[PDB]
Enzyme design. Structure first.
Site, PDB file in Angstrom:
ATOM      1  N   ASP A   7      77.619  37.418  63.345  1.00 12.69           N
ATOM      2  CA  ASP A   7      76.268  37.335  62.823  1.00 12.69           C
ATOM      3  C   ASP A   7      76.094  38.137  61.515  1.00 12.69           C
ATOM      4  OD1 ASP A   7      73.792  39.455  63.480  1.00 12.69           O
ATOM      5  OD2 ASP A   7      73.284  37.388  62.907  1.00 12.69           O
ATOM      6  N   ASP A 105      73.862  32.056  58.882  1.00 10.25           N
ATOM      7  CA  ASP A 105      74.372  33.401  59.117  1.00 10.25           C
ATOM      8  C   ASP A 105      74.830  33.666  60.551  1.00 10.25           C
ATOM      9  OD1 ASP A 105      71.928  33.938  60.485  1.00 10.25           O
ATOM     10  OD2 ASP A 105      71.167  35.277  58.928  1.00 10.25           O
ATOM     11  N   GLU A 106      75.690  32.801  61.098  1.00 10.29           N
ATOM     12  CA  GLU A 106      75.984  32.865  62.553  1.00 10.29           C
ATOM     13  C   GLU A 106      77.030  31.895  63.042  1.00 10.29           C
ATOM     14  OE1 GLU A 106      72.917  32.212  65.459  1.00 10.29           O
ATOM     15  OE2 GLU A 106      71.983  34.171  65.052  1.00 10.29           O
TER      16      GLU A 106
HETATM   17 CA   LIG Z   1      71.175  35.104  62.753  1.00  7.95          CA
END
Ligand SMILES: [Ca+2]
EC number: 2.7.7.7
Length: 341
Positions: A7, A105-106
């Site tokens: 993350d 973002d992950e």
């Molecule tokens: Ca995230």
DNA sequence: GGTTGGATGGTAG
DNA sequence: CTACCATCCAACC
């Protein structure tokens, strides 16, 4: 069943830090600017020094400006972060080839092959964390447990630049004293709906009837919450894919006028075909947010793919149809592309 | 149960 | 805000 969930820390505002490294250890505020009166819009990210005074994603920029006029405000080149982002998913790949990507973002690895145990996962977790920093100078917070949830929560724990391993033991103590707020997928509103009704921790959902659950928060989340409270949630790490691809852009004002809206509606189709690239959708939906906040979709589904020109004049017909049904002036517009080949 | 309608809300970055 | 998914009446093979 071992999960390695990664993350990217305050990602968007973090990339603006690395890009302009004179922008750092300071309040950074990545922003989507709407267009109307002298700024306007909403925050999409802020680094930790920003969000320690309350300046967090989705709040009107004027507050961000009225708590941190200090702060640095930067626009939102989502293209750019995408670039940098994709590059990370390659590194995440190398170390395990069952890479379920989610948001920009992950991402989640099912590393159950190149580990014998959790000791070894930590060592890997440091590896990944060390390769992503080295090559792109981006701190990220890995999390580890049995399942994409516990994997994620463990990250939610030591969030900024961190690494944690929730074995089985801590799996079980969470359930009892883990709040439904802190349960991924569950945004606040579900929580506050549950919060109100005497209902806080996740396990409490075992002391509550099922039909009195899908009669408030719905099935998916009813079961989803009961399954982790039971613990019987260890479901697969499979890749994600996109159905919709849209862009509702803010007009200059409110307009009952075919010609006024057109270029805004065509500008959407335009950018909507930026993000779509090689792929070709079967269905189209012209969205309208009115005067107030009503939402007025009308759409059309084909037995073929659509072509941009086709996509323009069909959009209009679909817009015309908004105006002999709606009578209220319209104050936001856009398009949407379901159903791909 | 599929499948194309549209209206809302909820979960994010 | 922008983006995308889910979510729930409504027709109907
Ligand atoms: Ca995230």
């Amino acid at each position: 069943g071992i999960v390695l969930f990664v993350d990217f820390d305050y990602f968007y505002a973090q990339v603006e830090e690395v890009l302009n490294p004179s922008l750092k250890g300071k309040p950074v505020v990545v922003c989507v600017f709407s267009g109307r009166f002298e700024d306007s819009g909403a925050v999409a990210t802020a680094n930790y020094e920003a969000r320690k005074f309350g300046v967090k994603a989705g709040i009107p920029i004027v507050e961000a400006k009225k708590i941190l006029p200090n702060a640095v405000y930067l626009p939102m080149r989502k293209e750019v972060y995408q670039q940098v982002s994709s590059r990370i998913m390659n590194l995440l790949r190398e170390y395990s080839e069952k890479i379920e990507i989610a948001s920009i973002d992950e991402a989640y690895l099912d590393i159950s092959d190149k580990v014998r145990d959790y000791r070894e996962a930590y060592n890997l977790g440091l590896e990944i964390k060390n390769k992503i920093l080295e090559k792109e100078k981006i701190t990220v917070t890995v999390g580890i447990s049995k399942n994409k949830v516990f994997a994620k929560i463990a990250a939610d724990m030591a969030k900024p630049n961190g690494i944690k391993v929730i074995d089985d033991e801590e799996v079980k103590r969470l359930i009892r004293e883990l709040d439904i707020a802190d349960v991924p997928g569950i945004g606040n509103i579900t929580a506050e709906k549950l919060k109100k009704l005497g209902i806080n921790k996740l396990v409490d959902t075992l002391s509550i009837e099922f039909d009195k659950l899908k009669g408030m928060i719905g099935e998916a989340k009813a079961k989803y919450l009961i399954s982790l409270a039971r613990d019987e949630y260890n479901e697969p790490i499979r890749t994600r894919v996109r159905k919709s691809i849209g862009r509702i852009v803010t007009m200059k004002r409110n307009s009952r006028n075919l010609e006024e809206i057109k270029p805004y509606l065509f500008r959407a189709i335009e950018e909507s075909y930026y993000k779509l690239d090689k792929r070709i959708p079967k269905a189209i939906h012209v969205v309208a947010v009115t005067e107030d906040l009503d939402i007025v979709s009308r759409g059309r589904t084909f037995p073929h793919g659509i072509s941009k020109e086709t996509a323009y004049s069909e959009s209009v017909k679909l817009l015309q149809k908004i105006l002999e049904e709606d009578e209220r002036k319209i104050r936001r517009i856009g398009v949407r592309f379901s159903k791909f080949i």
